[PDB]
Amino acid sequence: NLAPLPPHVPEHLVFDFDMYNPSNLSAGVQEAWAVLQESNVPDLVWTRCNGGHWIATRGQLIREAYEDYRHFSSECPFIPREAYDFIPTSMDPPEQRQFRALANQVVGMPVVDKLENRIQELACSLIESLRPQGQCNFTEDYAEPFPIRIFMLLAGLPEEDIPHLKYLTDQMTRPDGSMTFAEAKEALYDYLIPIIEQRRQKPGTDAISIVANGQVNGRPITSDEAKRMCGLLLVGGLDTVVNFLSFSMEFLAKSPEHRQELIERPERIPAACEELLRRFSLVADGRILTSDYEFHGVQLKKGDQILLPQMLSGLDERENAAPMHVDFSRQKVSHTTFGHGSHLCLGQHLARREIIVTLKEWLTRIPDFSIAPGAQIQHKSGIVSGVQALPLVWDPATTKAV
């Protein structure tokens, strides 16, 4: 199912990469995407998969396109072109600036600094519950429960609401069929709306209270705007963190030498986090052309979609030498893992703290662990690439109890 080549697209630029099922997937998802950076592949290519779209394959072009919001609009940020209404995903500057500022009040650095110890306590509780078992599926047993619990903390929501909320967010990205995306989204709004209304009347210092009482265009934020922002604050931090933590733990389970480095020098963990963010980058979003535009010698047409994979910038050998090698001592770790330009991840500070806290606590309590005997780790590819499951094993006698 290749879409017919639009007549403005020259055949020599055609490379039929399928972002949802890349051909090299069993070799690892980052490796599968990195085929776009082989020397026979232009900086900018067209694929006929998934409706047909451009792909920028190099960090220079990926960065430039994210900077040039006048040409590359977020109005349609996903491939393929086909109910999504979260804020401020689909907004271009200048509409976007006010909403970002508000979201920044609830997940910005000062909030992350205040929450850090709570995040650690949560990580500790999860790890301690798994420690004596000598095994887990890390993706399911630690990664999945962790970010949703951090959201409940950030948003001041009771833990009793977790199973239902997690179900709704799971339906938006991995539907079992019980709910369409639109139904899942509306159920999420059914949940958030009463809470937003109550906290407009009786505010706390939690994220929902702050969003609900925010100001837009010199007037109060509307309930519709508030639910759409809260929805994004919820979903934006789930699959990205789950899968990223899984890539990192897979690598650490498989590379005892890198693991030992962090055991011996825990102070290097924040730098290691940055290098892992580069090597195991996982997002691939896009933009839509606002007008006909010649970009690096290539004629783009108004309405063309362009995939601008955040994942690829840091894997580009032009940005980082020997880019598939993990080296926690890199003097310059170049990446766009959290994006670039006006939509740069608002959760980047929270995410890094989640990653660093997880690694610190896991290496403290369970320093020696491996991939389960016999297991082969499977990746998945898409807008957020990921790990299907991560069976880990360890000897409880080598662990340190709480």
Ligand code: HEM
């Ligand atoms: C490893 C973890 C994460 C990664 C790799 C990541 C990646 C990204 C990227 C690449 C973007 C820009 C998308 C684009 O330009 O189309 C983005 C935006 C965003 N992220 Fe994250 N994210 C992570 C964690 C989080 C967390 C923990 C939160 C919230 C608690 C969050 C909330 C958001 C929001 C609200 C936006 C939209 C910003 C805007 O449009 O102005 N993210 N994220």
